[PDB]
Amino acid sequence: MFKDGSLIPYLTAGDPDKQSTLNFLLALDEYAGAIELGIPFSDPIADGKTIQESHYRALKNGFKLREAFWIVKEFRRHSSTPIVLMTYYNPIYRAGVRNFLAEAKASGVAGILVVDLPVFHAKEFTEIAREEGIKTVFLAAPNTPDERLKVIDDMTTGFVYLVSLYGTEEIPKTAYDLLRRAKRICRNKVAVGFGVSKREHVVSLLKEGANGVVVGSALVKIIGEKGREATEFLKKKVEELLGI
């Protein structure tokens, strides 16, 4: 979904509020190959500490599901950078898969990543996503075996998102091994969420074959600290990571 060498910011919708999120997106767009917008959830058990706290913040401040769509829709007026909605299944399930995906599209979403999509539902979900015009993004962690990477690559229409709960401050070996395995298997492009915090991380990861590098925790850490005034600090952290 993005150019090779792309940096992909991840932001939590409504952290600290929907207007600020929108502001952060507009400020980072010029460096983005694509953007992951996370829908906060009460039990984000698949995320690392930093991102989990951002979900807590967003929810405490009163985030409401469709505000995520408001954000995408407003962003669309200014830019066409691909946006991938990242969510837990619960919200989608409760709202009705097709309804959600349909609403997602109408607002401008290009792709969707369902963190904990039950395998039992993968098939129908992907079919509906295709019908509704939304590209799929599936996640794989270091404990994902080659056979599953393949099943994942065959269902993916957007890109494969490789993650590492490991944290770091070096990229863990197990993260690199996942990347190496994926490139040897995936036809789709792959993006990596290995918690980059330094310029050397971005350089290395792209050099090792990542088509794109997601930058989430780094960005979210500044937002948890600066609140609405995070903007400028965000632009500096991305420039730092890009060597500019």
PDB file of C-alpha atoms in Angstrom:
ATOM      1  CA  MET A   1       0.000   0.000   0.000  1.00  0.00           C
ATOM      2  CA  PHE A   2       3.047   2.231   0.299  1.00  0.00           C
ATOM      3  CA  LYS A   3       6.355   3.025  -1.413  1.00  0.00           C
ATOM      4  CA  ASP A   4       9.424   1.012  -0.349  1.00  0.00           C
ATOM      5  CA  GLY A   5      11.456   2.955   2.195  1.00  0.00           C
ATOM      6  CA  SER A   6       8.260   4.313   3.748  1.00  0.00           C
ATOM      7  CA  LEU A   7       7.981   5.392   7.373  1.00  0.00           C
ATOM      8  CA  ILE A   8       4.469   4.620   8.673  1.00  0.00           C
ATOM      9  CA  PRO A   9       3.276   6.633  11.687  1.00  0.00           C
ATOM     10  CA  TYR A  10       0.895   4.949  14.095  1.00  0.00           C
ATOM     11  CA  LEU A  11      -1.340   7.153  16.230  1.00  0.00           C
ATOM     12  CA  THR A  12      -4.126   6.402  18.639  1.00  0.00           C
ATOM     13  CA  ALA A  13      -7.474   7.940  17.714  1.00  0.00           C
ATOM     14  CA  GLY A  14      -8.595  10.421  20.352  1.00  0.00           C
ATOM     15  CA  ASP A  15      -5.286  10.698  22.230  1.00  0.00           C
ATOM     16  CA  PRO A  16      -5.778  13.214  23.895  1.00  0.00           C
ATOM     17  CA  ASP A  17      -8.751  14.227  21.714  1.00  0.00           C
ATOM     18  CA  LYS A  18      -9.927  13.782  18.128  1.00  0.00           C
ATOM     19  CA  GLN A  19      -8.941  17.280  17.016  1.00  0.00           C
ATOM     20  CA  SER A  20      -5.375  16.865  18.224  1.00  0.00           C
ATOM     21  CA  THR A  21      -5.127  13.451  16.521  1.00  0.00           C
ATOM     22  CA  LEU A  22      -6.224  15.127  13.328  1.00  0.00           C
ATOM     23  CA  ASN A  23      -3.602  17.821  13.948  1.00  0.00           C
ATOM     24  CA  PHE A  24      -0.888  15.203  14.471  1.00  0.00           C
ATOM     25  CA  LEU A  25      -1.830  13.433  11.209  1.00  0.00           C
ATOM     26  CA  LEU A  26      -1.726  16.652   9.191  1.00  0.00           C
ATOM     27  CA  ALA A  27       1.680  17.519  10.635  1.00  0.00           C
ATOM     28  CA  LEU A  28       3.195  14.100   9.888  1.00  0.00           C
ATOM     29  CA  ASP A  29       1.655  13.492   6.476  1.00  0.00           C
ATOM     30  CA  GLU A  30       4.653  14.936   4.611  1.00  0.00           C
ATOM     31  CA  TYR A  31       6.858  12.130   5.943  1.00  0.00           C
ATOM     32  CA  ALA A  32       4.294   9.339   5.736  1.00  0.00           C
ATOM     33  CA  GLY A  33       4.057   6.575   3.159  1.00  0.00           C
ATOM     34  CA  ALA A  34       0.893   5.434   4.912  1.00  0.00           C
ATOM     35  CA  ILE A  35      -0.742   5.891   8.332  1.00  0.00           C
ATOM     36  CA  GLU A  36      -2.064   3.492  11.010  1.00  0.00           C
ATOM     37  CA  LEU A  37      -4.913   4.960  13.069  1.00  0.00           C
ATOM     38  CA  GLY A  38      -5.701   2.913  16.146  1.00  0.00           C
ATOM     39  CA  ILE A  39      -9.174   2.583  17.607  1.00  0.00           C
ATOM     40  CA  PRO A  40      -8.677   2.574  21.399  1.00  0.00           C
ATOM     41  CA  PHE A  41      -9.940  -0.483  23.278  1.00  0.00           C
ATOM     42  CA  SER A  42     -10.532  -1.307  26.958  1.00  0.00           C
ATOM     43  CA  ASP A  43      -8.304  -4.405  26.817  1.00  0.00           C
ATOM     44  CA  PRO A  44      -5.482  -3.846  24.259  1.00  0.00           C
ATOM     45  CA  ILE A  45      -3.632  -6.937  25.506  1.00  0.00           C
ATOM     46  CA  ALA A  46      -1.679  -7.295  22.251  1.00  0.00           C
ATOM     47  CA  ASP A  47       0.050  -3.929  22.571  1.00  0.00           C
ATOM     48  CA  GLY A  48       3.138  -2.809  24.400  1.00  0.00           C
ATOM     49  CA  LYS A  49       2.923  -0.634  27.519  1.00  0.00           C
ATOM     50  CA  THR A  50       3.230   2.706  25.720  1.00  0.00           C
ATOM     51  CA  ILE A  51       0.408   2.074  23.275  1.00  0.00           C
ATOM     52  CA  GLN A  52      -1.794   0.480  25.930  1.00  0.00           C
ATOM     53  CA  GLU A  53      -1.581   3.656  28.022  1.00  0.00           C
ATOM     54  CA  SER A  54      -2.578   5.760  24.995  1.00  0.00           C
ATOM     55  CA  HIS A  55      -5.719   3.621  24.625  1.00  0.00           C
ATOM     56  CA  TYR A  56      -6.472   4.267  28.310  1.00  0.00           C
ATOM     57  CA  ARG A  57      -5.973   8.009  27.833  1.00  0.00           C
ATOM     58  CA  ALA A  58      -8.183   8.207  24.744  1.00  0.00           C
ATOM     59  CA  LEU A  59     -10.978   6.250  26.402  1.00  0.00           C
ATOM     60  CA  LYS A  60     -10.781   8.197  29.682  1.00  0.00           C
ATOM     61  CA  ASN A  61     -11.131  11.428  27.722  1.00  0.00           C
ATOM     62  CA  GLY A  62     -14.281   9.945  26.256  1.00  0.00           C
ATOM     63  CA  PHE A  63     -13.356   8.548  22.839  1.00  0.00           C
ATOM     64  CA  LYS A  64     -16.276   7.170  20.846  1.00  0.00           C
ATOM     65  CA  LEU A  65     -15.895   4.687  18.000  1.00  0.00           C
ATOM     66  CA  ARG A  66     -17.160   6.805  15.114  1.00  0.00           C
ATOM     67  CA  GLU A  67     -14.976   9.727  16.140  1.00  0.00           C
ATOM     68  CA  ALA A  68     -12.289   7.591  14.458  1.00  0.00           C
ATOM     69  CA  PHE A  69     -14.210   7.944  11.217  1.00  0.00           C
ATOM     70  CA  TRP A  70     -14.580  11.686  11.784  1.00  0.00           C
ATOM     71  CA  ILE A  71     -10.789  11.851  11.937  1.00  0.00           C
ATOM     72  CA  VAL A  72     -10.278   9.908   8.694  1.00  0.00           C
ATOM     73  CA  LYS A  73     -12.928  11.937   6.879  1.00  0.00           C
ATOM     74  CA  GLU A  74     -11.427  15.289   7.908  1.00  0.00           C
ATOM     75  CA  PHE A  75      -7.933  14.109   7.021  1.00  0.00           C
ATOM     76  CA  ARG A  76      -9.180  13.062   3.564  1.00  0.00           C
ATOM     77  CA  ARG A  77     -10.089  16.645   2.729  1.00  0.00           C
ATOM     78  CA  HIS A  78      -6.400  17.532   2.921  1.00  0.00           C
ATOM     79  CA  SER A  79      -4.626  14.365   1.823  1.00  0.00           C
ATOM     80  CA  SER A  80      -4.754  11.039   0.035  1.00  0.00           C
ATOM     81  CA  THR A  81      -2.115   9.225   2.133  1.00  0.00           C
ATOM     82  CA  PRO A  82      -3.412   5.667   2.671  1.00  0.00           C
ATOM     83  CA  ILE A  83      -4.936   5.174   6.087  1.00  0.00           C
ATOM     84  CA  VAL A  84      -5.169   1.802   7.781  1.00  0.00           C
ATOM     85  CA  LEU A  85      -7.625   1.520  10.630  1.00  0.00           C
ATOM     86  CA  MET A  86      -6.135  -0.705  13.386  1.00  0.00           C
ATOM     87  CA  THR A  87      -8.702  -2.198  15.749  1.00  0.00           C
ATOM     88  CA  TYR A  88      -9.591  -5.039  18.080  1.00  0.00           C
ATOM     89  CA  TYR A  89     -12.425  -7.271  16.884  1.00  0.00           C
ATOM     90  CA  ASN A  90     -14.950  -6.494  19.645  1.00  0.00           C
ATOM     91  CA  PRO A  91     -15.946  -3.031  18.257  1.00  0.00           C
ATOM     92  CA  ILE A  92     -16.390  -4.421  14.744  1.00  0.00           C
ATOM     93  CA  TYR A  93     -18.322  -7.463  15.933  1.00  0.00           C
ATOM     94  CA  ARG A  94     -20.722  -5.426  18.047  1.00  0.00           C
ATOM     95  CA  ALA A  95     -21.320  -2.976  15.201  1.00  0.00           C
ATOM     96  CA  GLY A  96     -21.672  -5.613  12.492  1.00  0.00           C
ATOM     97  CA  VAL A  97     -18.729  -6.424  10.200  1.00  0.00           C
ATOM     98  CA  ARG A  98     -20.115  -5.198   6.872  1.00  0.00           C
ATOM     99  CA  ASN A  99     -21.684  -2.123   8.506  1.00  0.00           C
ATOM    100  CA  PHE A 100     -18.327  -1.193  10.019  1.00  0.00           C
ATOM    101  CA  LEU A 101     -16.264  -1.889   6.910  1.00  0.00           C
ATOM    102  CA  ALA A 102     -18.853  -0.022   4.829  1.00  0.00           C
ATOM    103  CA  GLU A 103     -18.740   2.966   7.160  1.00  0.00           C
ATOM    104  CA  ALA A 104     -14.948   2.713   7.159  1.00  0.00           C
ATOM    105  CA  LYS A 105     -14.798   2.974   3.375  1.00  0.00           C
ATOM    106  CA  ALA A 106     -17.300   5.842   3.128  1.00  0.00           C
ATOM    107  CA  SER A 107     -15.113   7.890   5.470  1.00  0.00           C
ATOM    108  CA  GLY A 108     -11.976   7.242   3.436  1.00  0.00           C
ATOM    109  CA  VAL A 109     -10.285   4.259   5.090  1.00  0.00           C
ATOM    110  CA  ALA A 110      -8.082   2.323   2.667  1.00  0.00           C
ATOM    111  CA  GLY A 111      -7.288  -0.725   4.764  1.00  0.00           C
ATOM    112  CA  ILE A 112      -8.008  -2.481   8.021  1.00  0.00           C
ATOM    113  CA  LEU A 113      -6.018  -4.442  10.566  1.00  0.00           C
ATOM    114  CA  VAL A 114      -7.955  -6.453  13.115  1.00  0.00           C
ATOM    115  CA  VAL A 115      -5.414  -7.269  15.818  1.00  0.00           C
ATOM    116  CA  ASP A 116      -7.237 -10.285  17.267  1.00  0.00           C
ATOM    117  CA  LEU A 117      -9.294 -11.552  14.360  1.00  0.00           C
ATOM    118  CA  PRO A 118     -10.510 -15.064  15.289  1.00  0.00           C
ATOM    119  CA  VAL A 119      -9.306 -17.532  12.661  1.00  0.00           C
ATOM    120  CA  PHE A 120     -12.849 -18.918  12.663  1.00  0.00           C
ATOM    121  CA  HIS A 121     -13.912 -15.612  11.136  1.00  0.00           C
ATOM    122  CA  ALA A 122     -10.960 -14.761   8.887  1.00  0.00           C
ATOM    123  CA  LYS A 123     -12.537 -16.047   5.657  1.00  0.00           C
ATOM    124  CA  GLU A 124     -15.881 -14.234   5.783  1.00  0.00           C
ATOM    125  CA  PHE A 125     -14.161 -11.126   7.089  1.00  0.00           C
ATOM    126  CA  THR A 126     -11.707 -10.973   4.175  1.00  0.00           C
ATOM    127  CA  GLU A 127     -14.515 -11.605   1.682  1.00  0.00           C
ATOM    128  CA  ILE A 128     -16.580  -8.758   3.115  1.00  0.00           C
ATOM    129  CA  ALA A 129     -13.523  -6.512   3.230  1.00  0.00           C
ATOM    130  CA  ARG A 130     -12.930  -7.197  -0.443  1.00  0.00           C
ATOM    131  CA  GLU A 131     -16.594  -6.590  -1.311  1.00  0.00           C
ATOM    132  CA  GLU A 132     -16.575  -3.308   0.622  1.00  0.00           C
ATOM    133  CA  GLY A 133     -13.367  -2.133  -1.061  1.00  0.00           C
ATOM    134  CA  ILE A 134     -11.109  -2.275   2.008  1.00  0.00           C
ATOM    135  CA  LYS A 135      -7.626  -3.779   1.873  1.00  0.00           C
ATOM    136  CA  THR A 136      -6.585  -6.287   4.510  1.00  0.00           C
ATOM    137  CA  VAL A 137      -3.580  -6.018   6.808  1.00  0.00           C
ATOM    138  CA  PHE A 138      -2.728  -9.061   8.922  1.00  0.00           C
ATOM    139  CA  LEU A 139      -0.356  -9.213  11.841  1.00  0.00           C
ATOM    140  CA  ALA A 140       2.369 -11.736  12.620  1.00  0.00           C
ATOM    141  CA  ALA A 141       4.654 -11.944  15.664  1.00  0.00           C
ATOM    142  CA  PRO A 142       8.025 -13.644  16.201  1.00  0.00           C
ATOM    143  CA  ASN A 143       6.225 -16.805  17.297  1.00  0.00           C
ATOM    144  CA  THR A 144       4.413 -17.099  13.975  1.00  0.00           C
ATOM    145  CA  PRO A 145       5.621 -20.182  12.045  1.00  0.00           C
ATOM    146  CA  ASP A 146       6.459 -20.203   8.335  1.00  0.00           C
ATOM    147  CA  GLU A 147       3.278 -22.137   7.471  1.00  0.00           C
ATOM    148  CA  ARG A 148       1.151 -19.414   9.044  1.00  0.00           C
ATOM    149  CA  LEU A 149       3.063 -16.577   7.374  1.00  0.00           C
ATOM    150  CA  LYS A 150       2.077 -18.204   4.097  1.00  0.00           C
ATOM    151  CA  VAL A 151      -1.620 -18.490   4.984  1.00  0.00           C
ATOM    152  CA  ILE A 152      -1.382 -14.882   6.115  1.00  0.00           C
ATOM    153  CA  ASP A 153       0.289 -13.682   2.923  1.00  0.00           C
ATOM    154  CA  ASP A 154      -2.365 -15.432   0.805  1.00  0.00           C
ATOM    155  CA  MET A 155      -5.200 -13.568   2.610  1.00  0.00           C
ATOM    156  CA  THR A 156      -3.482 -10.172   2.593  1.00  0.00           C
ATOM    157  CA  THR A 157      -4.495  -7.497   0.097  1.00  0.00           C
ATOM    158  CA  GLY A 158      -2.846  -4.550   1.856  1.00  0.00           C
ATOM    159  CA  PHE A 159       0.406  -5.628   3.497  1.00  0.00           C
ATOM    160  CA  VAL A 160       1.725  -7.936   6.178  1.00  0.00           C
ATOM    161  CA  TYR A 161       2.392  -6.209   9.493  1.00  0.00           C
ATOM    162  CA  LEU A 162       5.206  -7.831  11.478  1.00  0.00           C
ATOM    163  CA  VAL A 163       5.371  -6.994  15.171  1.00  0.00           C
ATOM    164  CA  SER A 164       7.567  -7.596  18.150  1.00  0.00           C
ATOM    165  CA  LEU A 165       6.215  -7.387  21.716  1.00  0.00           C
ATOM    166  CA  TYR A 166       9.881  -7.745  22.694  1.00  0.00           C
ATOM    167  CA  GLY A 167      10.459  -4.011  22.982  1.00  0.00           C
ATOM    168  CA  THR A 168      14.205  -3.419  22.849  1.00  0.00           C
ATOM    169  CA  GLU A 169      17.905  -0.673  23.060  1.00  0.00           C
ATOM    170  CA  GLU A 170      18.447  -2.883  20.018  1.00  0.00           C
ATOM    171  CA  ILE A 171      16.006  -4.549  17.631  1.00  0.00           C
ATOM    172  CA  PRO A 172      15.791  -8.038  19.108  1.00  0.00           C
ATOM    173  CA  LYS A 173      17.274 -10.916  17.075  1.00  0.00           C
ATOM    174  CA  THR A 174      13.893 -12.618  17.083  1.00  0.00           C
ATOM    175  CA  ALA A 175      12.418  -9.521  15.344  1.00  0.00           C
ATOM    176  CA  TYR A 176      15.035  -9.687  12.568  1.00  0.00           C
ATOM    177  CA  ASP A 177      14.464 -13.415  12.191  1.00  0.00           C
ATOM    178  CA  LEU A 178      10.740 -12.779  11.659  1.00  0.00           C
ATOM    179  CA  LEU A 179      11.571 -10.188   8.978  1.00  0.00           C
ATOM    180  CA  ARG A 180      14.004 -12.531   7.262  1.00  0.00           C
ATOM    181  CA  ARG A 181      11.431 -15.355   7.297  1.00  0.00           C
ATOM    182  CA  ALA A 182       8.660 -13.108   5.948  1.00  0.00           C
ATOM    183  CA  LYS A 183      10.692 -11.767   2.996  1.00  0.00           C
ATOM    184  CA  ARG A 184      11.508 -15.331   2.034  1.00  0.00           C
ATOM    185  CA  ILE A 185       7.772 -16.104   2.086  1.00  0.00           C
ATOM    186  CA  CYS A 186       5.617 -13.031   1.486  1.00  0.00           C
ATOM    187  CA  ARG A 187       4.628 -11.690  -1.919  1.00  0.00           C
ATOM    188  CA  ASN A 188       2.794  -8.820  -0.252  1.00  0.00           C
ATOM    189  CA  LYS A 189       4.899  -5.944   1.023  1.00  0.00           C
ATOM    190  CA  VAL A 190       5.792  -6.067   4.701  1.00  0.00           C
ATOM    191  CA  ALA A 191       5.963  -3.307   7.291  1.00  0.00           C
ATOM    192  CA  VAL A 192       7.610  -3.759  10.675  1.00  0.00           C
ATOM    193  CA  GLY A 193       6.525  -2.643  14.132  1.00  0.00           C
ATOM    194  CA  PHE A 194       9.638  -3.387  16.169  1.00  0.00           C
ATOM    195  CA  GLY A 195       9.514  -0.288  18.368  1.00  0.00           C
ATOM    196  CA  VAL A 196      12.090   1.884  16.601  1.00  0.00           C
ATOM    197  CA  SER A 197      13.553   4.662  18.734  1.00  0.00           C
ATOM    198  CA  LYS A 198      16.718   5.486  16.796  1.00  0.00           C
ATOM    199  CA  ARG A 199      17.758   6.443  13.274  1.00  0.00           C
ATOM    200  CA  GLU A 200      19.981   3.355  13.062  1.00  0.00           C
ATOM    201  CA  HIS A 201      16.850   1.190  13.532  1.00  0.00           C
ATOM    202  CA  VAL A 202      15.091   2.626  10.478  1.00  0.00           C
ATOM    203  CA  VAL A 203      18.232   2.409   8.327  1.00  0.00           C
ATOM    204  CA  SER A 204      18.927  -1.176   9.376  1.00  0.00           C
ATOM    205  CA  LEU A 205      15.345  -2.430   9.019  1.00  0.00           C
ATOM    206  CA  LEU A 206      14.957  -1.061   5.507  1.00  0.00           C
ATOM    207  CA  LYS A 207      18.376  -2.444   4.651  1.00  0.00           C
ATOM    208  CA  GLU A 208      17.200  -5.852   5.849  1.00  0.00           C
ATOM    209  CA  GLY A 209      14.203  -5.788   3.558  1.00  0.00           C
ATOM    210  CA  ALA A 210      11.341  -4.087   5.383  1.00  0.00           C
ATOM    211  CA  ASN A 211       9.323  -2.262   2.675  1.00  0.00           C
ATOM    212  CA  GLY A 212       8.102   0.033   5.378  1.00  0.00           C
ATOM    213  CA  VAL A 213       8.787   0.965   8.982  1.00  0.00           C
ATOM    214  CA  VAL A 214       5.939   1.790  11.335  1.00  0.00           C
ATOM    215  CA  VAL A 215       6.774   4.356  14.021  1.00  0.00           C
ATOM    216  CA  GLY A 216       4.257   4.193  16.833  1.00  0.00           C
ATOM    217  CA  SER A 217       5.537   3.961  20.379  1.00  0.00           C
ATOM    218  CA  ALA A 218       8.134   6.652  19.757  1.00  0.00           C
ATOM    219  CA  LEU A 219       5.406   9.024  18.574  1.00  0.00           C
ATOM    220  CA  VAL A 220       2.851   7.931  21.186  1.00  0.00           C
ATOM    221  CA  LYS A 221       5.356   8.433  24.006  1.00  0.00           C
ATOM    222  CA  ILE A 222       5.707  12.106  23.094  1.00  0.00           C
ATOM    223  CA  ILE A 223       1.905  12.500  22.891  1.00  0.00           C
ATOM    224  CA  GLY A 224       1.481  10.903  26.305  1.00  0.00           C
ATOM    225  CA  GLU A 225       3.883  13.563  27.527  1.00  0.00           C
ATOM    226  CA  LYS A 226       3.118  16.687  25.497  1.00  0.00           C
ATOM    227  CA  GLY A 227      -0.634  16.212  25.079  1.00  0.00           C
ATOM    228  CA  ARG A 228      -2.169  18.552  22.477  1.00  0.00           C
ATOM    229  CA  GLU A 229       1.183  20.314  22.124  1.00  0.00           C
ATOM    230  CA  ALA A 230       2.927  17.175  20.891  1.00  0.00           C
ATOM    231  CA  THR A 231       2.796  18.211  17.212  1.00  0.00           C
ATOM    232  CA  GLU A 232       6.127  19.996  16.824  1.00  0.00           C
ATOM    233  CA  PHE A 233       7.929  17.388  18.900  1.00  0.00           C
ATOM    234  CA  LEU A 234       6.424  14.739  16.638  1.00  0.00           C
ATOM    235  CA  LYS A 235       7.795  16.374  13.503  1.00  0.00           C
ATOM    236  CA  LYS A 236      11.265  16.475  15.104  1.00  0.00           C
ATOM    237  CA  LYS A 237      11.222  12.802  16.104  1.00  0.00           C
ATOM    238  CA  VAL A 238      10.196  11.751  12.580  1.00  0.00           C
ATOM    239  CA  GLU A 239      12.872  13.936  10.973  1.00  0.00           C
ATOM    240  CA  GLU A 240      15.418  12.447  13.377  1.00  0.00           C
ATOM    241  CA  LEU A 241      14.300   8.950  12.352  1.00  0.00           C
ATOM    242  CA  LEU A 242      14.529   9.907   8.655  1.00  0.00           C
ATOM    243  CA  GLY A 243      17.989  11.413   8.953  1.00  0.00           C
ATOM    244  CA  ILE A 244      16.705  14.896   8.153  1.00  0.00           C
TER     245      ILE A 244
END
